[PDB]
Design a protein around this nucleic acid. Structure first.
Ligand code: MG
Ligand code: ZN
Lengths: 23, 159, 81, 620, 227, 687, 224
DNA sequence: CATCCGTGAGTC
């Protein structure tokens, strides 16, 4: 997932793990 | 002043061309020459002579050699003339029609001078005619083509 | 030797240009005749002495210019400058 | 032709339709006929179809940079609310289809429509008044489509095979109608080299003389050829009476054919011939199989190998500057050279690695569109980027766009990309201003007479003399001589005159003087010929659009201005130089010239250059 | 409105104009009718030949102007109608100075040559010429490698068989403006045939043929359609 | 225009305006990209026109400090060890320090991998620097971009020129009848939709007590009830269709901050700026020559690219000197067939159909008691009909406009509705249109790939795959490598993998190419949604591999290859295309440049009050301008009569244009032009 | 060099059916199955809703009190409604349902000669206090006919013209087995693939296709 | 040869 914060549809992401801060 | 009026024309045409050559643009020398020709149509007044030509004034070759053709027949001193090269901007401003000049640039300056010199405009040009709504003095506008009578050949006749 | 000229390309302009001094002349040449043909149709209804009508067969709802341009090709007109 | 929307035209011809509505009694007067058109009653769609019959309209696309910016068309009613435009005149309007609009003006007076159909009709304005080259030619899909079939593929199926053993000759067909049925079965490739007997195509001039003795080729006379099926279909368009062309159709090749058709064959032939080419280009651009994939775009094999070589040659330069043996001005000046050399070797790495099947290269090398410098940027690497100053950055973008640029790379490329868009907007404003100055200065210049009659002209260098012998064609030949009319009979060493005076220089008339040996001709110029008002017709010579002598009355002064300003957008001296010349400013360079000819006396000083000239003829 | 059929003419070929087709049926009718005239009409042509003074192909025939190649080609253009499916054989022999044509051919019973004025080969003096021809029947176009064993191996030559009596067909689809709709399709069709059959008849046969195909589908229900 | 359109507008950073600079004063230095802009202001998003570089958008992670400068977040590295502690830095403060790039490899604890890493330094200079000297590092790879910019998948594959347009055009997207989320995302599509405010977010947690198309009621945990009303069919500032629909069903458990109902251009709380279209990269019979676009008629028969556009029409009744304007159903000399769609007042009835020229609000005004024509006096004695003193001043439908009347707003001075001095009754009629997509409508993708619709073929004419499915959109191959925006190509590849679904081969282990691929993407369903964050996400090796993983259709056959291409059948000739064509799915947006607005024409109409020339604009029904540049083209041709006509009888010849209209309708010849009234003005201005 | 009258075989499935046709001319199969494909997708007669009316609604752009969907989404849901009518003239259907719960295509009441083939189709989720009284009009036609045409005829202000997708055909394709073995064994075998909407049978679709085409190709046979 | 004022700086 990318933004697992609100209760959103699951959009899987090619990524290096981004945990600095939410937009 | 070094190589004369004809050489300076050939130099401009090819130096101009050299810029469009480098970037892959192909303009025939012809078109350039048309503009170049318009830059040298005026010669300056070295000595006034008997003529009414103000010294230090750029006057057309046609006018310069026709007034020096009238005064030569009059008996007075002809004005001494030296050829002069003009940038297209001022050559354009120095036009005979104040209508064409004012409708180009520096409109406040054109009118100030023209209203003082009492310059009368013969509406005979492209910019001149378009403004007043006359047919332009070129192409299908010239009387040569404009006044044409078309008639059926004597062979052609109603059935 | 070419393909059949369609619509506004007919009559072929090349053969049109053989019967005239320049492109510019042909315009006034044709147009002033197009004026004559349209006069004839409007005048005839109520006026005698109109310009001579179409020297060729008028196509159905054929434009007056299109009529003139054809009879120029037919050499049926006289040319004066 | 042009597609005019049913909605646009009805309001354009509104009082012309109201006229015929009360003619055919659909309406009882002019007031009610107006109401019919506004309510859009179903009757008027039949009436309007008759009204616009061969009544030309104008298509204007701003900016109007040259006179081909406004062209006439035969209006065609069309469903929808968009204007439909011919794919060829896009070179003239400089119009694409990313949301471009066009103004429409409907001529009323009998003279106006006459002027439109004759002077301004798109099918008459085929050539550029600036160069005489075709503008209404195959351009994008069309060139790639034709370039497809005229290509000769070595081992493709159906190819001609010599006879050997027990099997006879394979690949020889009786007629084009046969070879068509072969590819339909799947035996023949439309790109494979075969042998066919043709009956409706005039053979090459070199072969017509061998097979007929120039007995005059005739529709029905046969002859054998060694081409491909596609090259035959292509020559049926040119069509008959024109010598067969057995080559592959690069844009320059197609540019030659049309430019030849412009000369000899008449206008209505060219207009129809080029039309057939368009229909052929698109159908075959379709089945050309030209497609962009991530696979078709390949990164070079020696990608990291080559870049490691020059980064090693760079680190050597960095350490040579680290010891301060190199100047700071010299450090970057060498760093620029290293990576410029690197980028080149990356491009070479693509060309040979890329198949000629590769649609990215197929499009580039066929003159269709795009540069290989784009292909390099895409598959190889972006290379050097420009500084805000303009100087090339010492740091290089090693990444291609296929691999994905680094975050920092995108930033500095973006900077350059913006300043490019800014300048491209600023030159245009300068270009249009220069244009309007040029127009005003040459407005009283019109063709008023047929001939000045003066013997004055100017010398043109026809060809340079090659050192070993023979000659070399001057690079300025096309632009300085090819349209001129002679002012003096051109004679060789003999007393034999090759070209008379009052003769327009054509293509073969250059070769008659080129082979004869004469390398200098005197020609009538606009400068030399002197008349009262404007200029003469003869001096000016061949109008680049007609291919014939300019008509008396053409405003050659304005056309010249447009012809100079139109392509002014493509400059780096540059455009300021062009202004600096036409405005006769005392230049920046201010290079000195010799006052009197003589022996040069160089006496350089390190603080200052001084030049003395001892006059050749006595003098001081 | 029911569709029309038209004809503009020439001796060997003619153009057919079909309008007005329901929008989108021009192309639906286009390539399907072309591939029928070119492939689905039966005739007769030369399968293989045999020449007396030939043991290999590169050398021309003794006493003949034309090469071995150019004679095969001229023979390909020969139009012939055979009455029996089974392969027949015709002989063409001539000697001395002059020109050999298609009228010199000796044809079997029920086998007709339709262009007896066709040039074939120019013989000179002391020039002997004897040729055996093998005539079969079929459809469309068949390559030469598939006919490499249809003659005695003492100089048997495989020839490209052009069975089909229709030579070349092209088509264009323009749009006709019916009522207010400018969507309707107009089908122009160019058809050139041999000297065997008229184009006007070659289409009716090519037209009848396809009616049979779409019969199979229609047989199931014959539900609905309107003309 | 769309939710993003509004969101972008609030984040603009102009250098224009009072206290700032003028457009002509700004040189070439103000406009270009400055080094300090990193993470603060976007280098991509800026207008194309004469305002370029003077207008920009704020970078995503940036914020404003109490002194009016722009701060930006960086992660704090103690000693080669990344710390989650974050401090916001200003422009000049960062210059004194040294910053590492976001994508630098980091230990699972927090340490760096290589001693020397990529380093950002003052004055836009960059060098390799040992790990002991590293002060800070970037928050995100996508730190430097703006909101609309980060919504461009594979941004780092498109050149800044087209990527610029790719950002600018998204703002021009049109809200469709219903909207789909893109198959290829970037992750930004969620937070953009929420922070737009044009969706409905739940304030406090609870359960949906009741849901209707009108409103949603939420039962909280403490007992209180908040009701969220749905904006239904409202007209935006730009005539687009702001229409909201409830996502949740009745009885769903909803937490705080969750989207319970989204608006236009939104699908399940995500920015839905377009539709997922089945693309084909190829030339096709020239109909897509020079950036034109071919569409499947499926997009017309299924309203896939259909939009709703609402217009507000206004008219008032004032107090005049001859009486007062009154809004009535009685208009002089009009049949009852024209009035048929009005009520008793004079107002059109809601739901009625309106075409151009028809009447919306019937108003008549007392015309001045001037002596009526002696020829019209005579005409009124014969038929004995006395003239009324009321002239028709009705509100008719403007040329081009048409649709269904979807509401009336009337304000009366009588009903105490407070009006400006002089007005009695004011009427507002609202008319919506259901514009399907047609020829000339400008479409675009996110990669600066724009263009108009050249032709929409019937569904059968479309180049189709082996299983019969026709493609939706046919883009031309030629206009791709030139623009350097081959991210549209990568979107097509990943777009196809997302539609078919995939599955990496786990037998014999996890393959080496899909080794960096996170676990959750090793198996994907048909019609799956994925994220490709800018400067992160998919790389070319994984994309190529995924093209091999493509799951077969219902018939058990794979449709595209490892190249990403597939074999098409020409729907016209039937025969298969000779070469494999690149097929996949692309996200295409409907931009707000529609022909229905763009088209315009005029025979005669209104005229200038001073120069007596035609007026200008479609709004005033004015004619085109034949400028100085166009008069040169005429002059060059030598078409004097055409040029004269345009500037005389076609323009400001007061007596000419009237006598031209008469000569035409009578079928005579066009008279000779007179004197341009504008020239008379000049000779008086000089005087 | 062989003559055989062709066949038209069949390998079935409920919704879609493979037709096998052989033996055909070499290189003829493609341009033959395509001529059927283009006939199917465009000119096969079917039936669908043309216009509707709702209680308390005057135009497409509004909401019914108590219902979760708006009329736009409701009309858009009814586009996937599968109907088959035999009445050549227009017929009127009905749907009336009140209170809580869901409404479907099953609650539609088709008169004589009208049949709904997909009753499980969701139309609207009527919450409590929500009432929905509708009135649908069904006609027979072919291809695709836009809603915009109904309105100008004289249709009262109550009616809401809806787009019509008459085409009962779903998805059509083909593949060809051409035996190119060097012999007189060169032929093509056609495999046509036709899937319907459960409005008509795949067979009945190919039958109306042929009946159309036969009547069209019959004009090439008629003499001058 | 270098300053101060006024006038220019693409179209739709
Ligand atoms: Mg553009
Ligand atoms: Zn002269």
């Amino acid at each position: 997932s990318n933004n697992s914060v609100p209760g959103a549809p699951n959009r899987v992401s090619f990524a290096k793990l981004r945990e600095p801060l939410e937009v | 002043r070094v190589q004369g009026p004809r050489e300076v024309q050939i130099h401009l045409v090819r130096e101009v061309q050299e810029v469009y050559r480098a970037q892959g643009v192909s303009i025939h020398d012809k078109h350039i020459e048309v503009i170049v020709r318009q830059m040298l149509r005026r010669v300056t007044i070295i000595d006034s002579g008997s003529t009414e030509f103000l010294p230090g004034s750029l006057i057309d070759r046609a006018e310069f050699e026709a007034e020096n053709r009238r005064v030569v027949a009059e008996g007075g001193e002809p004005a001494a003339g030296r050829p002069v090269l003009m940038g297209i901007t001022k050559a354009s401003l120095a036009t005979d029609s104040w209508l064409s000049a004012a409708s180009f640039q520096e409109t406040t300056r054109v009118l100030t001078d023209a209203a003082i010199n009492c310059r009368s405009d013969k509406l005979n040009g492209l910019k001149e005619n378009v403004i007043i709504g006359k047919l332009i003095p070129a192409g299908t506008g010239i009387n040569r083509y404009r006044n044409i009578a078309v008639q059926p050949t004597e062979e052609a006749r109603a059935a | 030797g070419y393909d059949t000229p369609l619509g506004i390309t007919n009559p072929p302009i090349d053969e049109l240009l053989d019967r005239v001094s320049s492109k510019y002349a042909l315009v006034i040449y044709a147009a002033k005749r197009a004026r004559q043909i349209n006069d004839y149709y409007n005048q005839l209804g109520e006026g005698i002495l109109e310009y001579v009508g179409p020297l060729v067969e008028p196509g159905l709802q054929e434009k007056p210019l299109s009529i003139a341009l054809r009879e120029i090709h037919a050499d049926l007109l006289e040319h004066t400058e | 032709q042009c597609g005019l929307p049913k909605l646009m035209a009805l309001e354009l011809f509104k009082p012309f339709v109201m006229k015929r509505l009360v003619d055919l009694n659909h309406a009882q007067n002019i007031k009610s006929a107006k109401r019919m058109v506004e309510r859009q009653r179903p009757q008027v769609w039949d009436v309007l179809e008759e009204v616009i019959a061969e009544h030309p309209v104008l298509l204007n696309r701003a900016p109007t940079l040259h006179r081909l910016g406004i062209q006439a068309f035969e209006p065609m009613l069309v469903e929808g609310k968009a204007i439909q435009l011919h794919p060829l005149v896009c070179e003239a309007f400089n119009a694409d289809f990313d949301g471009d609009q066009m103004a429409v003006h409907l001529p009323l007076s009998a003279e106006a429509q006459a002027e439109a159909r004759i002077l301004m009709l798109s099918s008459n304005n085929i050539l550029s008044p600036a160069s005489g080259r075709p503008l209404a030619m195959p351009r994008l899909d069309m060139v790639t489509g034709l370039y497809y079939l005229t290509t000769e593929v070595p081992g493709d199926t159906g190819e001609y095979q010599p006879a050997s053993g027990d099997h006879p000759e394979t690949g020889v067909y009786s007629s084009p109608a046969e070879a068509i049925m072969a590819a339909d079965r799947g035996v023949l490739s439309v790109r494979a080299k075969i042998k066919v007997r043709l009956t409706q195509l005039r053979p090459p001039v070199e072969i017509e003389a061998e097979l007929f003795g120039h007995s005059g080729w005739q529709p029905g006379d046969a002859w054998m050829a060694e081409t491909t099926l596609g090259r035959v279909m292509f020559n049926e368009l040119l069509p008959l009476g024109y010598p067969f062309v057995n080559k592959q159709m690069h844009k320059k090749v197609q540019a030659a054919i049309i430019n030849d058709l412009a000369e000899r064959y008449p206008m209505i032939v060219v207009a129809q011939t080029v039309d057939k080419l368009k229909d052929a280009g698109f159908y075959w651009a379709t089945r050309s199989g030209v497609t962009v994939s991530m696979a078709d775009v390949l990164v070079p094999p020696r990608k990291k190998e080559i870049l490691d070589h020059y980064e090693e040659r760079a680190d050597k330069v960095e350490k040579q500057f680290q010891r301060g043996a190199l100047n700071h001005d010299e450090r970057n000046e060498a760093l620029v050279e290293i990576w410029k050399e690197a980028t080149d070797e990356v491009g070479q790495a693509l060309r040979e690695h890329y198949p000629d099947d590769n649609p990215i290269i197929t499009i580039v090398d066929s003159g269709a569109t795009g540069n290989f410098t784009q292909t390099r940027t895409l598959a190889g690497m972006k290379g050097l980027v420009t500084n805000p100053k303009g100087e090339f950055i010492p740091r290089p973008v090693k990444s291609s766009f296929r691999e994905g640029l680094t975050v920092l790379e995108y930033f500095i490329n973006t900077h350059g990309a913006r300043k490019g868009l800014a300048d491209t907007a600023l030159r245009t404003a300068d270009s249009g201003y220069l244009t309007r100055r040029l127009v005003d200065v040459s407005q009283d210049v019109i063709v008023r007479e047929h001939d000045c009659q003066t013997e004055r002209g100017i010398v043109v260098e026809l060809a340079e003399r090659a050192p070993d012998g023979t000659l070399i064609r001057d690079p300025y030949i096309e632009t300085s001589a090819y349209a001129r009319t002679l002012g003096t009979d051109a004679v060789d060493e003999a007393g034999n005159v090759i070209v008379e005076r009052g003769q327009d220089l054509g293509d073969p008339e250059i070769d008659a003087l080129l082979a004869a040996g004469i390398t200098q001709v005197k020609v009538r110029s606009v400068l030399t010929c002197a008349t009262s008002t404007g200029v003469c017709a003869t001096c000016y010579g061949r109008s680049m659009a007609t291919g014939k002598l300019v008509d008396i009355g053409e405003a050659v002064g304005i056309v010249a201005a447009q012809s100079i300003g139109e392509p002014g957008t493509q400059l780096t001296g540059g455009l300021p130089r062009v202004q600096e010349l036409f405005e006769a400013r005392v230049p920046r360079g201010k290079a000195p010239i010799a006052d009197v000819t003589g022996r040069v006396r160089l006496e350089d000083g390190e603080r200052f250059y001084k030049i003395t000239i001892v006059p050749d003829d006595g003098g001081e | 409105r029911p569709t029309l059929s038209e004809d503009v003419l020439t001796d060997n070929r003619s153009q057919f104009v079909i309008e007005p087709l329901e929008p989108g049926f021009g192309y639906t009718l286009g390539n399907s009718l072309r591939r029928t005239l070119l492939s689905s009409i039966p005739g007769a042509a030369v399968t293989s030949i045999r020449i007396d003074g030939v043991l290999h192909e590169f050398t021309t025939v003794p006493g003949v102007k034309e090469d071995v190649t150019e004679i095969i080609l001229n023979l390909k253009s020969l139009v012939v109608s055979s009455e029996e499916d089974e392969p027949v054989t015709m002989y063409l022999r001539k000697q001395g100075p002059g020109e050999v044509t298609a009228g010199d051919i000796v044809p079997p019973a029920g086998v007709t040559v339709h262009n007896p004025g066709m040039h074939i080969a120019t013989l000179n003096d002391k020039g002997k010429l004897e040729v055996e021809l093998v005539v079969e029947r079929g459809r469309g176009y068949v390559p030469a490698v598939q006919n490499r064993a249809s003659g005695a191996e003492i100089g048997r030559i495989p020839v490209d068989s052009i069975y089909s009596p229709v030579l070349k067909v092209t088509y264009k689809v323009d749009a006709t403006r019916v009522e207010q709709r400018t969507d309707f399709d107009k089908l122009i069709l160019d058809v050139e045939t041999k000297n065997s059959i008229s184009p006007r008849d070659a289409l009716a046969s090519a037209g009848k043929t396809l009616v049979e195909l779409f019969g199979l589908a229609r047989e199931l229900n014959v539900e609905a359609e309107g003309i | 225009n769309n939710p993003l359109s509004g969101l972008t507008h609030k984040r603009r950073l102009s250098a224009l305006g009072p206290g700032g600079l003028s457009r002509e004063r700004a040189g070439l230095e103000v406009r270009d990209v400055h080094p300090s802009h990193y993470g603060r202001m976007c280098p991509i998003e800026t207008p194309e026109g004469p305002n370029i570089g003077l207008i920009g958008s704020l970078s995503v992670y940036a914020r404003v400090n109490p002194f009016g400068f722009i701060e930006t977040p960086y992660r704090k590295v103690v000693d080669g060890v990344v710390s989650d502690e974050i401090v916001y830095l200003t422009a000049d403060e960062e210059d004194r320090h040294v910053v590492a790039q976001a994508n630098s490899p980091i230990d699972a604890d927090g340490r760096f991998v290589e001693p020397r890493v990529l380093v950002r330094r003052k004055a836009g200079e960059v060098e390799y620097v040992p790990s002991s000297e590293v002060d800070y590092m970037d928050v995100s790879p996508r730190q430097m971009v703006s909101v609309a910019t980060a919504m461009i998948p594979f941004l780092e594959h498109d050149d800044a020129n087209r990527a610029l347009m790719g950002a600018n055009m998204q703002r021009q997207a049109v809200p469709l009848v219903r909207s789909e989320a893109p198959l290829v995302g970037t992750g930004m599509e969620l937070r953009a939709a929420i922070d737009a405010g044009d969706v409905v977010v739940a304030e406090e947690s609870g359960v949906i007590e009741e849901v209707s198309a009108d409103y949603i009621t939420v039962m909280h945990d403490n007992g209180t009830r908040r009701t969220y009303r749905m904006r239904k069919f409202a007209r935006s500032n730009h005539g687009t269709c702001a229409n909201q629909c409830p996502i949740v069903d009745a009885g769903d458990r909803v937490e705080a901050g969750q989207v319970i109902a989204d608006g236009p251009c939104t699908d399940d709380g995500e920015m839905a700026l377009g539709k997922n279209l089945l693309v084909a990269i190829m030339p096709w019979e020239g109909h897509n020559y020079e950036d034109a676009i071919i569409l499947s008629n499926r997009l017309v028969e299924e309203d896939v690219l259909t939009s709703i556009h609402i217009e507000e029409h206004e008219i008032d009744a004032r107090d005049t000197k001859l009486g007062a304007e009154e809004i009535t159903r009685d208009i002089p000399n009009i049949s009852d067939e024209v009035l048929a769609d009005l009520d008793e007042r004079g107002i059109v009835r809601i739901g009625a159909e309106v075409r151009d020229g028809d009447i919306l609000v019937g108003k008549v005004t007392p015309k001045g008691e001037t002596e009526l024509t002696p020829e019209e006096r005579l005409l009124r004695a014969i038929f004995g009909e006395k003239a009324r003193e009321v002239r028709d001043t009705s509100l008719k439908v403007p040329h081009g406009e048409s649709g269904k009347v979807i509401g009336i707003r009337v304000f009366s001075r009588e009903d105490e509705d407070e009006l400006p001095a002089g007005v009695n009754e004011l009427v507002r009629v609202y008319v919506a249109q259901k514009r399907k997509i047609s020829d000339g409508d400008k479409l675009a993708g996110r990669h600066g790939n724009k263009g108009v619709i050249g032709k929409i073929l019937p569904v059968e004419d479309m180049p189709f795959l082996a299983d019969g499915t026709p493609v939706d959109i046919i883009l031309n191959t030629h206009g791709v490598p030139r623009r350097m925006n081959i991210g549209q190509i990568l979107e097509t590849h990943l777009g196809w993998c997302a539609h078919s679904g995939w599955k990496v081969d786990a037998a014999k282990g996890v393959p080496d190419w899909a080794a960096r691929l996170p676990d959750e993407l090793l198996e994907a369903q048909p019609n799956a949604i994925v994220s490709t964050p800018v400067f992160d996400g998919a790389q070319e090796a994984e994309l190529q591999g995924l093209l091999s993983c493509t799951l077969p259709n219902r018939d058990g056959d794979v449709l595209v290859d490892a190249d990403g291409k597939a074999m098409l059948f020409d729907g016209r000739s039937g025969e298969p295309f000779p070469y494999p064509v690149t097929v996949g799915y692309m996200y295409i947006m409907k931009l707000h440049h529609l022909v229905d607005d763009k088209i315009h024409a005029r025979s005669t109409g209104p005229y200038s009050m001073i120069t007596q020339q035609p007026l200008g604009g479609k709004a005033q029904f004015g004619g085109q301008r034949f400028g100085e540049m166009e008069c040169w083209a005429m002059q060059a041709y030598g078409a004097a009569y055409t040029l004269q006509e345009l500037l005389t009888i076609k323009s400001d010849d007061t007596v000419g244009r009237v006598k031209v209209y008469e000569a035409i309708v009578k079928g005579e010849n066009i008279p000779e032009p007179g004197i341009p009234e504008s020239f008379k003005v000049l000779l008086k201005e000089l005087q």
